[PDB]
Structure 1
Amino acid sequence: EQSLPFFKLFSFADKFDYLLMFVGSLGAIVHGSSMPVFFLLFGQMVNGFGKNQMDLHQMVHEVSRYSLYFVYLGLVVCFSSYAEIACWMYSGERQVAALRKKYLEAVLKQDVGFFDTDARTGDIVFSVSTDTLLVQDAISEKVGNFIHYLSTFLAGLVVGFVSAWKLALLSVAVIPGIAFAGGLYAYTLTGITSKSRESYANAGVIAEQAIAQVRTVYSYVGESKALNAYSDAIQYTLKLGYKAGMAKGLGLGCTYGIACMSWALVFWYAGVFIRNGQTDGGKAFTAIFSAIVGGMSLGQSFSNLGAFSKGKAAGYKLMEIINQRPTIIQDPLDGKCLDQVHGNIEFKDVTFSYPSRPDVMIFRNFNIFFPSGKTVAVVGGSGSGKSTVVSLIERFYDPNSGQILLDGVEIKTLQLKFLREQIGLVNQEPALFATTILENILYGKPDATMVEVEAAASAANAHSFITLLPKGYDTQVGERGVQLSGGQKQRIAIARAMLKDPKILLLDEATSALDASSESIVQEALDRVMVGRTTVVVAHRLCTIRNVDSIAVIQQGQVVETGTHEELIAKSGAYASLIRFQEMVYFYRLLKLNSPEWPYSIMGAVGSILSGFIGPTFAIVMSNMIEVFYYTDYDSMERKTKEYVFIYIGAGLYAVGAYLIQHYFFSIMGENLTTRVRRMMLSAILRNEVGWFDEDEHNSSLIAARLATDAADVKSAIAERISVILQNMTSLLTSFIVAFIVEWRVSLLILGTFPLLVLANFAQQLSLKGFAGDTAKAHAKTSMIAGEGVSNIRTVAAFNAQSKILSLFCHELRVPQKRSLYRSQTSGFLFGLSQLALYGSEALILWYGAHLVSKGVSTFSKVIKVFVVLVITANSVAETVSLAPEIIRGGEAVGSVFSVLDRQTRIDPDDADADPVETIRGDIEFRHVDFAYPSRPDVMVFRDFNLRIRAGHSQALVGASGSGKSSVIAMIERFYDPLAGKVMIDGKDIRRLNLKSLRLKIGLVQQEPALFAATIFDNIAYGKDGATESEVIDAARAANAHGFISGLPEGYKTPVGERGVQLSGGQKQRIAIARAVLKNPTVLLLDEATSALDAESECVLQEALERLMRGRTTVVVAHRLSTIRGVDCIGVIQDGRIVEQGSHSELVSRPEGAYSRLLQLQTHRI
């Protein structure tokens, strides 16, 4: 993008802030250096403990000192960590707050030229909020984290290198081998996952189409073929899921095996060194662990880099507005001061063009004069948003051509604020910034009293009007309870204009809201303050411009003439037509749902139990190895070490043999459940009622997206967690049993202090993700003010209150800074206190153990075999607690999303014992039926409606341009339910019939060209499923669409729609006719595309539909004013009431009645 330079984000601090930077850096360095020191202390103490095996009166002597050393190290770590966290977080917060202050201060400094509604104004809110959050997070946490881990790296590397000079190279040699497997695993898993998430979409599009056109699929209901295709695709998805699970298991197993093999190698070769007379045991131990931890510290270190570059991208596109110079500003040394303002305006040859883009000329030689105290106004040729004529009054845009003067005095040399207080301006948008009404009134004049406010309200007819509220006249404009525009607020701005009392006040096209009492009243209120005002009103609508005694006629952009509307009627002035036109206007039964897979899962738990034994075995054997080194015979340790190396290689093979089994069998539990829950969920969705789809959020583009994520969430929520919990619990339980069997008198202290150790290890884990916690949860309150302010730049420019806005913004930052200041301490101190214990308890345990020997019964063993095999498991068990948010805090909603799985339907598709449907003549009667739109309950559509077909008469219905009649046909089919009334079919109500059979018998035609994703042959074949292609060809002949498909090379086999050919014209509806003739139903419905089908060749459509009704009497509902072929039935029904039960062929004789409103179009206005 640009330079995006670092070390430039740190350019807004002071001498009171750099000290925090230095203290934080020192703390991070100390922490990082301290982490590998503990290994050196442990190794030195182990060496000292072992070297005096038969010299009892040295244990306490050389153990108490190291206990003191441990407590010292704990204190140092506590203080360093607390200091680093507090200093870094507070400094970052302060820097970002200062940057926001400067940015918002500079935002209003420039003019509105940069501000246009071309998504730039929307861009500003985003580039404030998200950009500031990104910068803050990036610097304030990642810099400290990076420094800490780099220090850990360097200290570990140096302390490892200078121990023995030999074991370090071997220790570091094994790292690239592990990293190779670690990278290959990630690459293969990511590739397989990316490949997998493609087959599902192949039927996800089918599902999206199905829910997209539910109103059609219920007609000709198959509701099963789509489900079969969905199952077919989900089968392949299941296969790829099995493959992915098997690959993941095998990869993890082989990685752990290679790690175990490397451990065996390093231990054997170190042991070869041990009895070669070159080094001791404990120093080798600390060398190995220090080198490994130093090498591995880089893994979590460089990961902080990812945000850093983004921060640089955040650095630019911000602060760029800071150094932008506007056009004009109130220069203090202007030296201009005028009195006796009259309000004379002199424009000279004004021709302007929009700087954003050259376009049609705004004006040409526009040189009008405005006399003082008159009602002069101007109007454009077609409106064209000429309100900018007053913009030059406020001077948003500099005049390029000529010059502008006020009262014969040039407006440029004078100070900008001078003309501000000669300007009274109101904007069309009546709503204003969210603030209490009294403060909003105060913007007219700062030091205003209650008497002035009530006088202005009386002038604006607002006194005792807004008072009819529960609040004591302290409501806020932005409050949602007074969200009504113009109801009670009545455009407070005019009142505050009365508070300002400017020399000249300007208006706009505020009458667009309505023409009623309130705005008329404010109109004569404006006319009351018209004295001493050269008020100019510019509006696209010119109905209420009679009061203006000076109007200018301009159409091409050049001023033509001025005068009065009374004499403008001569020659029509190109204005008579305009005025004439204006006057003419949770886990309860998920496993129960998983019951069918009774096998393939218990073996998974067996594999988990078998795999959980790797940890304690490794710890026990390593402790035996660290014990055996102190044998002093220089013989017979070779056999023991060979046996221990063999057991390492056997265990390394065991992980490969176990993880594969576990993560292959659990893949079945994770995938079969998803495949069997998706189908059930979709089946439940399909059988829902129609009105459930009417909600905007309940969209066809939303249900499928929700389904895709929530189906996959179940596998993670209900399958992996069981395995993880079982593995960790069995590992811990085995470890404690081994500890107790080995020794009992020491384990009491460990079991007592275990919660503290696991708490410290848990805090170490949270240290990685950052202690900043949630952001913008309480930091967005100022951002909302900033975003709202930057929207109404034009409004804020009028009635200049930039200082007040800046003061409010400055005062609003007191909350987040205080919260961050509290958070820094309450996090750092607690973290330090926790980190003290993890090393303090070490001293207690080991001092007690050392005091046990030489005073009681124990040896060098049974004090390490109880220490190192419980510290490891205490470290391990922390992950179970760390996974708590996912199972309960995260899985309670996404894991329980199947509310649609058991939601009860309004109308029951699958009837139990409803009456069957036999050969039926199909006569429908309505008796006082009631209906309304479920989406809008406030709208009354049909009340006590009555309608009936006499005896098999071809009925035609008036359309009235489709004014709500489209529901009538939907009343015959079981789309919705009547509110109250009787819908009789064949002497019985429609509510007591097996709706599937009736749907098979109901005939209906849609008025949309959308169709399915299959080929055209399947499109015709959809109706009357299972029909031979011969009758399909016959129906194609009848529909007269053979030419429409023969031109295409593929003929009947061409795919149509998306990923296929596209056809134009209304022939697709004709294709639906081909479907209808396949049904040839005993009951049929018809409809026409109202105000949509503007294509020609409607005669073919009329002939085809006439051919459709040859064998059966049908009913037609259409908006077509002509081409009605119904017999003795026109049924003119309007206003939700029956007003005509006659015939069109005989209603022509009626001069007055329903025919008068029927004669509205019907003949000529076609």
Structure 2
Amino acid sequence: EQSLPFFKLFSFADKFDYLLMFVGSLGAIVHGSSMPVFFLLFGQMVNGFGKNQMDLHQMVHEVSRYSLYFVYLGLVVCFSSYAEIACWMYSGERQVAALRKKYLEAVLKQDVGFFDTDARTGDIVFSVSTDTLLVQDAISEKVGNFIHYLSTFLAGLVVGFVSAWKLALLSVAVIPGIAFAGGLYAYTLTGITSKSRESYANAGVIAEQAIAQVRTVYSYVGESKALNAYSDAIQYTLKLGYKAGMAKGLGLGCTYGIACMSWALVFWYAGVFIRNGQTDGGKAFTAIFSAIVGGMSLGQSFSNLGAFSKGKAAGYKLMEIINQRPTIIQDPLDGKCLDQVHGNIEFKDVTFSYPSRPDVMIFRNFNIFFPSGKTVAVVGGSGSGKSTVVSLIERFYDPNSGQILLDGVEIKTLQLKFLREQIGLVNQEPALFATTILENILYGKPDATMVEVEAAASAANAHSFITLLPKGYDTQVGERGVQLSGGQKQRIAIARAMLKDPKILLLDEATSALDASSESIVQEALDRVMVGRTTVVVAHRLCTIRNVDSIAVIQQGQVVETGTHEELIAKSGAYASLIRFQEMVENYFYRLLKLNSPEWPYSIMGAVGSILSGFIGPTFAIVMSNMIEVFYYTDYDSMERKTKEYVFIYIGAGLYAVGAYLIQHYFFSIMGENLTTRVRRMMLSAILRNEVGWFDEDEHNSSLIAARLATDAADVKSAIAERISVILQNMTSLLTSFIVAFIVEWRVSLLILGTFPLLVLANFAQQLSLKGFAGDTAKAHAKTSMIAGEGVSNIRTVAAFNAQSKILSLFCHELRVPQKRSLYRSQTSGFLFGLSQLALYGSEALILWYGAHLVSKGVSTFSKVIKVFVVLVITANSVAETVSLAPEIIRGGEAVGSVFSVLDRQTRIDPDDADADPVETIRGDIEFRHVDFAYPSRPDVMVFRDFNLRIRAGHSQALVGASGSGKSSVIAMIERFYDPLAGKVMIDGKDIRRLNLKSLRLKIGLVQQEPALFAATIFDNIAYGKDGATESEVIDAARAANAHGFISGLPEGYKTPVGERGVQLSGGQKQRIAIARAVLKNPTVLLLDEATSALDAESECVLQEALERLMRGRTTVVVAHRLSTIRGVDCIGVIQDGRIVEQGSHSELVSRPEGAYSRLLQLQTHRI
């Protein structure tokens, strides 16, 4: 799209924010420049040991002096880090809060006409939340990291170059090799990740179809069949994961080998330089380490730059809306007002077209009149602007060509604080803000008194309902503690309209919630208002239009006829069509480890690699310490040989690192991939062996369960394998570091042992600061975003009942709270970070001072203090890296908390066939005992209560839908889709819950309400009903539905993608293949299903052939709300209130039972 200039992001600011940014920038610069100063001081102190091991007293003096300097640097870093973190966090929060406040103010003031619910409501709210979060991300703290790391870069180059020369050059020239190796590793990792993502996308599109059409999958046994394709796909993904692990192991090995070569070359050339006499033993350390930390500085700064660019794009997207100038302007200085209005609404040559798209015509020559103190009814046959008149009287749309007068006063010169204040409006499903009930009433009146609130609500059919709450007019509709979310939501909008007492009362089609007696209660409340008021009626259905004293009907751009409710019905003038159209109507980890038992050989090699890496670490530390000690030798001839085998040791260590990392990562990747494949197979097998009622909930569709297998199945293997590897490696390294430490010197190692918690804590804080101290900022702004969304989503309601100022107070309060939270969090984080850094530097100074003093009392030398110190510092760094994994393991109970839940979530039916006696042949004895059933998703359904029916062999049934009185539940209880609440089901003289389900399901087939095809070419979509037949009977059964000519025309013969990424077929073709499957399987019991007019097959010919071919020797059950093509030659029934009300064949039900079945005849008649 487009972006904004970056320094235009800091527009909504203040003097205080300028000061905060200044302080934060100064702190960041000081911090960054301070770290290489620490390197310089350490180099000088090491030189102080090195050049003074004959002048013992001077050693003590200089070591104490530089320990004091370390303390000073610790103090400076403390204060600087506190300053940068606190100032930047607080400034970012203040500015983003100001931006949110400005943004929400614009929407309310900006005109309402452009909000046409054409996905605009969902766009704006997500824009607000997510994009304000993005802007805050790009402003608050990442600028601090950017400045800090760029400052470390600039200070790092300067310090080495002024230190001596020629090594800040070599190291800076070499570090591009490390950078390129890391970049190549990242590129390969991204490529292999994309390939694995594609492979699992194929696997998921193969799998998720079974879950969605579970009823078809269960009916036609495919549990073994479905799992084989998943097995093949997951084996492909397993091979790809093996390759991925191999590649990442090689990448780590190669990058560490290149690092070892770099260190070897740098140390060798340094040792060359000291030999000549151009550099001491302390300057080289400073130069090398300064250059390397500069390299990491560039890495972090580049990451920050990417984040900044993304934030810039988001910020432009936000700032697009604010500056949009509106059309209608409310202004006391220009807009005037009147008094004692009369409601004489008149339209004079009103023409308008939608500004978004004016190609269509809406109100071409629109001219209607609204009387005063009366009621009018505007109704249209379709979307011809019947719902637009309310969007035109309300000043929602300016008439681009025309004039409208109010009692002789034209309305374009009236402010939107007086005209709208005299009008009351109700809309479709009036949304209620997440506040108390008493707040909703206050929309109609800000604050006058309380007695009128109770008086007006009395005549609103809600005074009794509000009393059914153990609170003082307090109810939080947001937090669903008390769930008053029934279908008949409380009509508090009527009460809030009553409180305002508007002269004008616009109406809307507020009946779209499956109107019933509950929706018929509100008719009296609606009829109680139109007394002495200039009100209208806008309706879509004429069921409740029976009481109107004047009805005007518009058809195309203009009104056709007017009059009362006496002549509109008569003369059949453009009104008979409307009524006719109306009439057509915690041992989990051990269990996981046990589940990985067969893959134990790989675990041993993985562990071996772990110990080998643990030995890699301290080896590097010891060799570096030896080089540091060697630099101070006096015999230059001896230095060459020692540096020679030290360089060879570096080369050997590089090769060793390559090999060890290869072994460890490869074998642990193999183990992890095998474990995740096994758990995926087990989880899918468990899921397919579940109850249908488990899929009925809104969280167990094909879009969530199939998504859990994506992220949860990989997280478990990641957790187990990676945590085991890292813990083993670092634990071995730590043990090696102490064992080498406590042998070379046992006194100095005790102080470092004592101060070790401080060092590990400080390094932990340093590594934690890289990802920011903010934390779940989306959750902090969880109520402001909700208030903004509710204010924007129902802005149509907010336009009336003028409340453009009351929302801002709530927004201000709920913005004030997170400002305090951010203030406290920022100050605490700054203080703790400063204390941790001060502790680190003070501890290091104390360690070195005590070491130097211990050297003085002739029981040590310049060989053991330095070695133990550097080894223990590096192993403290490694242990700090280890500790950071603890939050990852702890993180939300890392995703094996539900992986192992569904894996052992026992079902209700439990179709398991452990020892139940199997069935060889079913002859047909379908009989229903006393059975009641309720939907597990909604227990409030009591459609079934003591149902009873009997079906004999070799016949059919024609159970009508009966206005959807549980029509789609008899088919779900012939087979074990649902468990009856009470009673049993007897089939073939035996209980249903005593026999294997597979045998009963493989000889009974159904016809689904919505036929569907699997995600494959059309060769098994016809043969899915029977396994064993390949080409013999498929063609024979293909001539059951007249679609052979349809399949004759196809490029690739029979094969064609229809599920996805291929040709798309019509609705009438899927049922042909479904009937083909039904006739190919050749079952004993058949089930038919037609409902909700979902056939969508004009000129019905496929059904007639099927009903005369599939009934030869198959028992079928027919259900259809339509009273057509359901001539059951055996029996027909009607289901009412969970029991049979009449039984018999079709002939016995036509003319014999004058009664409820007559409803059926008159129904078919109206329909025709």
Tell me the TM-score normalised to structure 2 length: 0.92
CA drift of 1:385 comes to 4.8
String of CA shifts for 1:4-31, please: whole Å, max 9, x gaps. 1121122233333322222211111111
1:972 is displaced (CA, Å) by 3.1
- Tell me if structure 1 keeps the 8 A contact 2:242–2:666: yes
Q: Which residue of 1 aligns with 2:222?
A: 222
What's the offset of the Cα at 1:517? 9.9
Deviation at 1:834, TM superposition (A): 0.9
CA drift of 1:436 comes to 3.2
1:1158 and 1:14, CA in 2 relative to 1: closer, same or farther beyond 3 A?
A: closer
The CA deviation at 1:181 is: 2.0
Q: Deviations over 1:132-168 (max 9, x none)?
A: 2111121121211111111111111011011222232
In the TM superposition, residue 401 of structure 1 has moved relative to its aligned partner by 3.1
Indicate how the Cα distance of structure 1 residues 696 and 543 shifts in structure 2: closer, same or farther if over 3 A, else same. Answer: closer
Question: Contact (CA 8 Å) 2:672, 2:721: kept in 1 or not?
Answer: yes
Alpha-carbon shift at residue 766 of structure 1 (Å): 1.3
More deviation in 704-713 or 1114-1123?
Answer: 1114-1123
Following superposition, the deviation at residue 1096 of structure 1 comes to 6.2
Distance 1:222 1:819, change over 3 A: closer
Quick one: structure 1 residues 51 and 309, their matched pair in 2 at CA, closer, same or farther if it must change by over 3 Å?
same
Measured after TM superposition, the shift of residue 533 of structure 1 is 3.3
Comparing 538-547 and 989-998, the one that deviates more:
538-547
Match of 1:1108 in 2: 1110
Q: Per-residue displacement from partner, 1:383-411 (whole Å, max 9, x unpaired)?
A: 74535445444322223334333332333
* Partners of 2:158 and 2:471 in 1: CA distance: 71
Q: Name whichever of 152-161 and 233-242 sits farther off.
A: 233-242
Q: Is the 8 A contact 1:543 1:583 kept in 2?
A: no
Over 3 Å counting, the alpha-carbon distance change for 1:84 and 1:570 in structure 2 is closer
The answer on whether the counterparts of 1:605 and 1:723 sit within 8 Å (CA) in structure 2 is yes
Distance change (3 Å), C-alpha of 1:1128 and 1:1110: closer
Aligned equivalents of 2:352, 2:1117: Cα separation in 1: 62
- In structure 2, relative to structure 1, the CA distance for the partners of 1:355 and 1:152 (3 Å cut) is same
Q: Secondary structure, in 3 states, of the residue corresponding to 1:424?
A: strand
Q: Given the superposition, is the C-alpha separation of residues 1135 and 469 from structure 1 closer, same or farther in structure 2, using an over 3 Å criterion?
A: closer
Deviation at 1:82, TM superposition (A): 1.0
Distance, in Å, in 1 between the alignment partners of 2:544 and 2:1092 is 37
Deviation for aligned residue 1:719: 0.8
Q: Alignment partner of 1:1139: what SS?
A: strand
Indicate if the aligned counterparts of 1:43 and 1:283 stay in contact, CA closer than 8 A: yes
Q: Distance in 2 between matches of 1:856 and 1:381?
A: 106
Contact kept? 1:110, 1:325, Cα under 8 Å: yes
Q: Deviations over 1:191-245 (max 9, x none)?
A: 2332233334444332222223332233342422332332233223222222222
User: Structure 2: how far apart are the matches of 1:459 and 1:898?
Assistant: 56
- Displacement, 1:430? 3.7
Q: By how many angstroms is 1:771 displaced?
A: 1.5
1:553 match: secondary structure? strand
CA, structure 1 residues 180+1030, in 2 after alignment: closer, same or farther (shift >3 Å)?
same
Contact 2:691-2:908 within 8 A present in 1 as well: yes
Pairwise CA distance, 1:955: 5.3
- The farther-off stretch of 246-255 and 996-1005 is 996-1005
Q: 1:36-81 CA distances to partner (integer Å, 9 max, x unpaired)?
A: 0111112212222222222223122222221221111111111111
Distance 1:796 1:175, change over 3 A: same
Question: Greater CA deviation, 1072-1081 or 159-168?
Answer: 1072-1081
Q: 1:825 and 1:1097, CA in 2 relative to 1: closer, same or farther beyond 3 A?
A: closer
- 1:114/1:265 CA distance change after superposition, 3 Å: same
Cα drift, residue 365 of structure 1: 4.4
Residues of 2 paired with 1:799 and 1:679: CA distance? Answer: 58
- Give the direction of change, closer, same or farther, for the CA distance of 1:500–1:37 in structure 2 (3 Å limit): same
1:362 CA displacement: 3.6
Structure 1 residue 881, shift from structure 2 partner: 0.4
The 8 Å contact of residues 89 and 141 in structure 1, kept in 2 or not, is answered as: yes
- SS in structure 2 at match of 1:378: strand
Residue 971 (structure 1) aligned to one of 961, 970, 973: 973
- C-alpha distance in structure 2 between counterparts of 1:653 and 1:1039, whole Å: 70
Q: Summarize the Cα distance change of 1:643–1:1010 in structure 2 as closer, same or farther, 3 Å threshold.
A: same
CA 750–961 in structure 1, closer or farther in 2 if over 3 Å, else same: same
Structure 1 161/1159 Cα, relative in aligned 2: closer, same or farther at 3 Å? same
Q: Which structure would you say has the larger Rg?
A: 1
Q: Larger deviation: 461-470 or 346-355?
A: 461-470
Q: CA deviation at 1:370?
A: 4.8
Deviates more, 1:1043-1052 or 1:890-899: 1043-1052
Of 1146-1155 and 427-436, the range deviating more from structure 2: 1146-1155
Question: Do the aligned residues in 2 keep the contact of 1:919 with 1:1082 (CA within 8 Å)?
Answer: no
Deviation at 1:782, TM superposition (A): 1.9
Is the contact between residue 717 and residue 895 of structure 1 (CA under 8 Å) also seen in structure 2? Answer: no
- Measure, in 2, the Cα distance between the counterparts of 1:867 and 1:803: 65
Asked if the contact 1:377–1:550 (Cα under 8 Å) also holds between the matched residues in 2, the reply is yes
Relative to structure 1, is the Cα distance of residues 1035 and 785 closer, same or farther in structure 2, using a 3 angstrom cutoff? Answer: closer
Report deviation, 1:124: 2.0
User: In 2 relative to 1, CA 1113–221 (structure 1 residues): closer, same or farther, beyond 3 Å?
Assistant: closer
Stretch of structure 1 that moved more, 599-608 or 206-215: 206-215
Distance 1:1088 1:791 in 2: 38
CA contact (8 A) 1:385 1:540 kept: no
Q: Which is further off, 60-69 or 378-387?
A: 378-387
Query: Displacement, 1:729?
Result: 0.5
* Structure 1 position 725, deviation (Å): 0.4
Residue by residue over 1:231-268, the C-alpha shift from the partner in whole angstroms, topping out at 9 and shown as x without a partner, is: 23322322222222222212211221221122122112
After TM superposition, the structure 1 stretch with the greater mean CA deviation from structure 2, 139-148 or 501-510, is 501-510
CA distance in 1, matches of 2:1105, 2:583: 44
Structure 2 unaligned residues grouped into runs of 5+: none
How much does 1:478 deviate? 6.2
Q: Distance in 2 between matches of 1:629 and 1:1083?
A: 92
SS of 1:465's partner is helix
Q: 1:253 to 1:428 in 2, by over 3 A?
A: closer
Residues 143 and 346 from structure 1, CA distance in 2 versus in 1: closer, same or farther, beyond 3 angstroms?
Answer: same
Q: Distance in 1 between the 2:371 and 2:1089 partners?
A: 63
Structure 1 residue matching 2:1118: 3-state secondary structure = strand
* 1:978–1:545 Cα change, 3 Å: closer
1:993-1029 CA distance string (max 9 Å, x none):
2333333333545565423445555455444432464
Q: What is the Cα deviation at residue 331 of structure 1?
A: 3.4
1:1065-1096 Cα offsets, whole Å, 9 max, x none, are: 75665555555555545555556678444536
| Structure 1, 846-855 or 7-16: larger mean CA deviation | 7-16
Q: Cα gap change, 1:587/1:390 in structure 2, threshold over 3 Å: closer, same or farther?
A: closer
Equivalent residue of 2:6, what SS? coil
CA contact (8 A) 1:238 1:675 kept: yes
Asked whether the equivalents of residues 426 and 493 of structure 1 are also in contact (C-alpha less than 8 Å), the reply is yes
Q: Which secondary structure does the structure 1 equivalent of 2:704 belong to?
A: helix
SS of 1:1088 mapped into structure 2: coil
Q: 8 Å contact 1:466–1:489 — kept in the other structure?
A: no
CA gap 1:611/1:442 in 2 versus in 1, 3 angstroms: closer
Unaligned runs of 5+ in 1: none
Instruction: Check conservation: 2:1013, 2:1059, Cα contact below 8 A.
Output: yes
How many Å apart are 1:1110 and its aligned residue? Answer: 3.5
Q: Does the C-alpha gap of structure 1 residues 163 and 695 become closer, same or farther in structure 2, counting only changes over 3 Å?
A: same
Per mean C-alpha deviation after superposition, the further-off stretch among 1125-1134 and 588-597 is: 1125-1134
**Stretch of structure 1 that moved more, 505-514 or 992-1001:** 505-514
Change over 3 Å in CA distance of 1:839–1:420 after alignment to 2: same
> Is the contact between residue 434 and residue 478 of structure 2 (CA under 8 Å) also seen in structure 1?
yes
What is the CA deviation profile of residues 852-875 of structure 1, one whole-angstrom value per residue up to 9, with x for unaligned ones?
123342112211112111111112
Is the Cα contact below 8 Å between 2:31 and 2:81 reproduced in 1?
A: yes
Say if 2:387 and 2:538, in contact at 8 Å, map to a contact too.
yes
Cα contact 1:1122–1:1163 (8 A) shared by 2: no
Q: Number of aligned residue pairs: give it.
A: 1166
**2:505 is paired with a residue of what secondary structure?**
coil
Contact 1:623 1:865 in 2 (8 A): yes
Q: Which moved more, 1:373-382 or 1:183-192?
A: 373-382
Partner of 1:934: 936
Change (3 A) 1:1009 1:844: same
Q: In the TM superposition, what is the alpha-carbon distance from 1:803 to its structure 2 partner?
A: 2.8
> Is the 8 Å Cα contact of residues 378 and 552 (structure 1) preserved in structure 2?
yes
Counterpart for residue 54 of structure 1: 54
Q: Shift of residue 802 of structure 1? A: 2.3
Shifted more, 184-193 versus 600-609: the winner is 184-193
Per the TM alignment, residue 581 of structure 1 is displaced from its structure 2 partner at its CA by 7.4
**Which stretch of the first structure deviates more once superposed, 406-415 or 600-609?**
406-415
2 CA distance for matches of 1:1115 and 1:793? 51
Specify whether residues 549 and 16 from structure 1 end up closer, same or farther in structure 2 by C-alpha distance, changes over 3 A only. Answer: same
Hey, what's the Cα distance between the residues in 2 that align with 1:1035 and 1:235? 35
